[PDB]
Short mmCIF file of C-alpha atoms in Angstrom, two decimals:
data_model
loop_
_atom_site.label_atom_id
_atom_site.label_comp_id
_atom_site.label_asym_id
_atom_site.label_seq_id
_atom_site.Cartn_x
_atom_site.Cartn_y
_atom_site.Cartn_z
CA UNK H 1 -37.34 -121.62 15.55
CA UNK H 2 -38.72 -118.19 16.59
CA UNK H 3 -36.67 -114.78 16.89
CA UNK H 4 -37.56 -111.34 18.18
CA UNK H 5 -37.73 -108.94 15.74
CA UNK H 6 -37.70 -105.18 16.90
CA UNK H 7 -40.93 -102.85 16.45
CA UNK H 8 -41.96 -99.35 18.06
CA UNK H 9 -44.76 -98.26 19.67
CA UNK H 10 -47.68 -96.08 18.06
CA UNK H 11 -50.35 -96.54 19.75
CA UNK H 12 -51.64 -98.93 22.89
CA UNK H 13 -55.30 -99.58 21.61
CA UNK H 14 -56.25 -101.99 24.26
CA UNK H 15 -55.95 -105.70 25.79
CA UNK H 16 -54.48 -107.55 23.42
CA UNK H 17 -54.06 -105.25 20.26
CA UNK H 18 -50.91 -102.57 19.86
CA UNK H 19 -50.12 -100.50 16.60
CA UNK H 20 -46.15 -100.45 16.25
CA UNK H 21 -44.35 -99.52 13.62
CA UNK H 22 -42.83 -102.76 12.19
CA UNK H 23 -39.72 -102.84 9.06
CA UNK H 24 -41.16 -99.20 8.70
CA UNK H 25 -44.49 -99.82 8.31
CA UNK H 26 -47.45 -99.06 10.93
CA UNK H 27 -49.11 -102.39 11.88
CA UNK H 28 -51.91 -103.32 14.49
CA UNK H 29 -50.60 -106.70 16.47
CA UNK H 30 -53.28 -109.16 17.74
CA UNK H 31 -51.94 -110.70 21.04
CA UNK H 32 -51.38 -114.68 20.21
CA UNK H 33 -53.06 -117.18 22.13
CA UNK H 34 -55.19 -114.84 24.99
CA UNK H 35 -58.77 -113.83 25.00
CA UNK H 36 -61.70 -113.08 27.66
CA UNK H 37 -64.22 -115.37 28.44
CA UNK H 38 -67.52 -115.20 27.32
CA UNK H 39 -69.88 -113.33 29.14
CA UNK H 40 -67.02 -112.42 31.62
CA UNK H 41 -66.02 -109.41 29.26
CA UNK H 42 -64.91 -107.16 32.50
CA UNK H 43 -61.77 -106.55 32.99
CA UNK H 44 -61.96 -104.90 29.74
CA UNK H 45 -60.42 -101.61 31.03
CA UNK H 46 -58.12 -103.49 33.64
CA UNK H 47 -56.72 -105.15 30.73
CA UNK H 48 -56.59 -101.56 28.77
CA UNK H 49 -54.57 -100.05 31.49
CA UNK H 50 -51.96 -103.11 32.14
CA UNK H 51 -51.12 -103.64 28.42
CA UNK H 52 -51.04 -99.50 28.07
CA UNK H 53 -48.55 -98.87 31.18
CA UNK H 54 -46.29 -102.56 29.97
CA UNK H 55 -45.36 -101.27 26.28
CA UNK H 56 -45.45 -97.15 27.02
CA UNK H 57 -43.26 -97.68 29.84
CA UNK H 58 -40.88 -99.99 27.48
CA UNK H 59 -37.86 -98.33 26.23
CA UNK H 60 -37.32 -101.63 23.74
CA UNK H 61 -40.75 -103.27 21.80
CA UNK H 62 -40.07 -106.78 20.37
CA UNK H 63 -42.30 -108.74 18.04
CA UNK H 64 -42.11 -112.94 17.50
CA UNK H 65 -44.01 -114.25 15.07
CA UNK H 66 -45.04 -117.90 15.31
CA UNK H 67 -44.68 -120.89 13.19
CA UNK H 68 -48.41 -120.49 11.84
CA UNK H 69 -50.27 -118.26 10.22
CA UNK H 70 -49.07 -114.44 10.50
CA UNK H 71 -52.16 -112.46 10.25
CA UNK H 72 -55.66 -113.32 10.79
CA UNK H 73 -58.93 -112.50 9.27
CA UNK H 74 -59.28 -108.95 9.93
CA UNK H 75 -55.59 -108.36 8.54
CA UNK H 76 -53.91 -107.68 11.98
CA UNK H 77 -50.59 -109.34 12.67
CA UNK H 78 -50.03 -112.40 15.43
CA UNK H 79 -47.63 -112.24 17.74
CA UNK H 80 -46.22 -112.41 21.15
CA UNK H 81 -44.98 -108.99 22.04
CA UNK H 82 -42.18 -108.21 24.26
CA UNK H 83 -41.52 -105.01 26.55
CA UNK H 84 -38.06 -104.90 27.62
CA UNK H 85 -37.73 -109.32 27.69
CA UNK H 86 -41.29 -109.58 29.66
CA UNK H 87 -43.82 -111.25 27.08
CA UNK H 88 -46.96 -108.91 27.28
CA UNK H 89 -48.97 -112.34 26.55
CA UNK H 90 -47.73 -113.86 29.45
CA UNK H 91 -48.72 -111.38 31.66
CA UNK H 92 -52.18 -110.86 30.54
CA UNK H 93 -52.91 -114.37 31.74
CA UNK H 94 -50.25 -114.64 34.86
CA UNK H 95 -52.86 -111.23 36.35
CA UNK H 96 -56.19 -113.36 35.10
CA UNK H 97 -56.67 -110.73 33.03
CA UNK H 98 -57.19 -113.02 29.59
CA UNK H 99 -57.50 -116.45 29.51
CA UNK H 100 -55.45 -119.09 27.37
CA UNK H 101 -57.13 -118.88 23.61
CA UNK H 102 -57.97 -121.80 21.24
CA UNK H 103 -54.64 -122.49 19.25
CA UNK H 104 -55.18 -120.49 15.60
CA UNK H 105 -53.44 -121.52 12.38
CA UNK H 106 -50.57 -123.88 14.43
CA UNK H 107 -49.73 -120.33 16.40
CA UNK H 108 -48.88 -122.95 19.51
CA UNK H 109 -45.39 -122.44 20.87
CA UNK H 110 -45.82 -120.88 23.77
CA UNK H 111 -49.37 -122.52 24.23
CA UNK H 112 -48.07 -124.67 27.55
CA UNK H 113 -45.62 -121.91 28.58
CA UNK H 114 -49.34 -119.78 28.89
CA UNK H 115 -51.62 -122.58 30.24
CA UNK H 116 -48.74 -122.89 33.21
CA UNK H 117 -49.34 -118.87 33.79
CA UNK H 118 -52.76 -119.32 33.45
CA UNK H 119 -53.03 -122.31 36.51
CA UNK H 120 -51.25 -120.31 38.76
CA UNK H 121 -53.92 -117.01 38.39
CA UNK H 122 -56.53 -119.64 38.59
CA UNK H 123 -54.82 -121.13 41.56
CA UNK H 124 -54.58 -117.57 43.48
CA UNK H 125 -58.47 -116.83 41.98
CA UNK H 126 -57.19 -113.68 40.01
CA UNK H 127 -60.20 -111.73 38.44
CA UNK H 128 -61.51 -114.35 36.03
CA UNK H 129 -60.96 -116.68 38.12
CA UNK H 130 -62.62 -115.24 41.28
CA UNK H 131 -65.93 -116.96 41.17
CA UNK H 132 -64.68 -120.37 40.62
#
């Protein structure tokens, strides 16, 4: 039930958050479903860099909304976000760069889709997953 939805870029910010300007307005987008583990918060510039390069490089931004809940708490939208067809969510996790997050709101499609990303960084030990 999901459909891309076309957005530019403002700003890269850093991991997992973009500004883009979205139906004309300027928005900050909260990657869905990826975060960093606890106490494993490196990678933090890594993950700066490889989201930065992904949607500046981009000549087409896409945003898909989910079938939850379209903002969260601190008012920024949730999304997966697409850089010429290659999900920036995906690729977070496929480097071991973020981990798989805890589902928020019913935001779960492409929960499995990530989890089978995220076993084959674990399986090659990718930076989170280098010390076992």
């Amino acid at each position: 039930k999901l459909h891309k939805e076309p957005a530019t870029l403002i700003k890269a910010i850093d991991g997992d958050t973009v500004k883009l300007m979205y139906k004309g307005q300027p928005m900050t987008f909260r990657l869905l479903l990826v975060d960093t583990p606890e106490f494993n918060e490196k990678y933090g510039p890594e993950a700066s860099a490889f989201t930065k390069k992904m949607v500046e490089n981009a000549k087409k931004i896409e945003v898909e909304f989910d079938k939850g809940q379209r903002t969260d708490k601190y008012g920024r939208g949730l999304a997966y976000i697409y850089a010429d067809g290659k999900m920036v969510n995906e690729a977070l996790v496929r480097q071991g760069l973020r981990k798989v997050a805890y589902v928020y709101k019913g935001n779960n499609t492409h929960e499995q889709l990530l989890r089978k990303a995220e076993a084959q960084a674990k399986k090659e030990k990718l930076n989170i997953w280098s010390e076992d």
